[PDB]
Design a protein around this ligand. Structure first.
Ligand SMILES: Nc1ncnc2c1ncn2[C@@H]1O[C@H](CSCC[C@H](N)C(=O)O)[C@@H](O)[C@H]1O
Ligand SMILES: O=C1C=C2NC[C@@H](O)C2=CC1=O
Length: 257
C-alpha cells in the first residue's frame, strides 16, 4: 500500500531490466522469454482492435513492443506519479529517458518482419496517446470520466496485480476491477511473478502475494475469462539476484467471454 511511496523507478529498472535480468543476448533468459510470449501471441493475428490499455505500466515499455502494431490507440497507466513521469521521458525522447533499444531490437528480431528498432519505437511512441493514473483496487480503476476510450479492445498487464495485492482475494478482486475495462470478447495478456513474496525498488520494500499457475488460472476463470494460453518460466539460479524471491514467471492469454 503506502510502501509504493518510496518506490524508486530507476532502481526498479536497474533491478529488473539491466543485466543480468536485462541481458537479452542469452535466449534462455527471462527477457527473451517474455518478449517471445508477447510476440508469438500477437503473431497469431487473434488479438486485434482499435484500443488497448496497459495496466500498471510502471516505468517500462517493453510490454507494448509487439503490441503497438495491432492497436492504433494505446493507453498506459500507473498508480505512481514518478512512474508516469518516467514513461513521459521516454515517450517525449527527453533527457535521462531509460534506454529500451536492446528490447526494441529483440522484439524486431523475434517478430521477424525485418523491421528496424527505430521504426518500432517510433510506432509505439505514436500510438501511445495518454498516460493515466490508475488504481486497480477501485471498482472503477481509471475513474469516472477517464480520457481513455472504453471499453478497451484488449488489455495488457505485467507484474502489477500480484505486486499490489496482499492476498489471493485482493488479487482476484483487482482482476475483477480491471476486467470491467475490457470489452466482452476482448483479450487480456497477463504477465507476473510466481510464488514471489517480496521485491526491492530502492528504499522501498514491496510485499507480494505469492501466486501459483493454478491459482492464476482459477482466478482468470472466476473473473470470466477463457484461458487460451498460460505458460510458466522457471527462474534459473543465476537470475536469482537478491532483489526479490520470485521463483518463476507466468504468461497468460485470456479471452473475455
Ligand atoms: N494500487 C495500484 N493500482 C495500479 N497499479 C499500482 C498500484 N499500486 C502500485 N502500482 C504499480 O504497480 C507497478 C508494479 S511494477 C510493474 C512495472 C511493469 N508493468 C513491468 O512490467 O516491470 C508499480 O509501478 C506500481 O506503481
Ligand atoms: O517484480 C518483478 C518484476 C519483473 N520483471 C521481470 C521479471 O524478472 C520480474 C520479477 C519481479 O519480481
Amino acid at each position: 500500500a503506502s510502501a509504493y511511496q518510496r518506490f524508486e523507478p530507476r532502481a526498479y529498472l536497474r533491478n529488473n531490466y539491466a543485466p543480468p535480468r536485462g541481458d537479452l543476448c542469452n535466449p534462455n533468459g527471462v527477457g527473451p522469454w517474455k518478449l517471445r510470449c508477447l510476440a508469438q501471441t500477437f503473431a497469431t493475428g487473434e488479438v486485434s482492435g482499435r484500443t488497448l490499455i496497459d495496466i500498471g505500466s510502471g516505468p517500462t515499455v517493453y510490454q507494448l513492443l509487439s503490441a503497438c502494431s495491432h492497436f492504433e490507440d494505446i493507453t498506459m497507466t500507473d498508480f505512481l506519479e514518478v512512474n508516469r513521469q518516467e514513461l513521459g521521458r521516454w515517450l517525449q525522447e527527453e533527457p535521462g529517458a531509460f534506454n529500451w533499444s536492446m528490447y526494441s531490437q529483440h522484439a524486431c528480431l523475434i517478430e521477424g518482419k525485418g523491421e528496424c528498432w527505430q521504426d518500432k519505437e517510433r510506432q509505439l511512441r505514436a500510438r501511445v496517446k495518454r498516460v493515466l493514473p490508475i488504481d486497480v483496487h477501485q471498482p472503477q480503476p481509471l475513474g469516472a470520466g477517464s480520457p481513455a476510450p472504453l471499453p478497451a479492445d484488449a488489455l495488457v498487464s505485467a507484474f502489477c496485480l500480484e505486486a499490489v495485492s496482499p492476498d489471493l482475494a485482493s488479487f482476484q478482486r483487482a482482476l475483477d476491477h480491471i476486467t470491467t475495462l475490457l470489452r466482452p470478447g476482448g483479450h487480456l495478456l497477463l504477465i507476473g511473478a510466481l510464488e514471489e513474496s517480496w521485491y526491492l525498488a530502492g528504499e522501498a520494500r514491496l510485499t507480494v502475494v505469492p501466486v501459483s499457475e493454478e491459482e492464476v488460472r482459477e482466478a482468470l476463470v472466476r473473473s470470466g475469462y477463457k484461458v487460451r494460453d498460460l505458460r510458466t518460466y522457471i527462474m534459473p539460479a543465476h537470475l536469482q539476484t537478491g532483489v526479490d524471491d520470485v521463483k518463476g514467471v507466468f504468461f497468460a492469454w485470456a479471452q473475455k467471454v
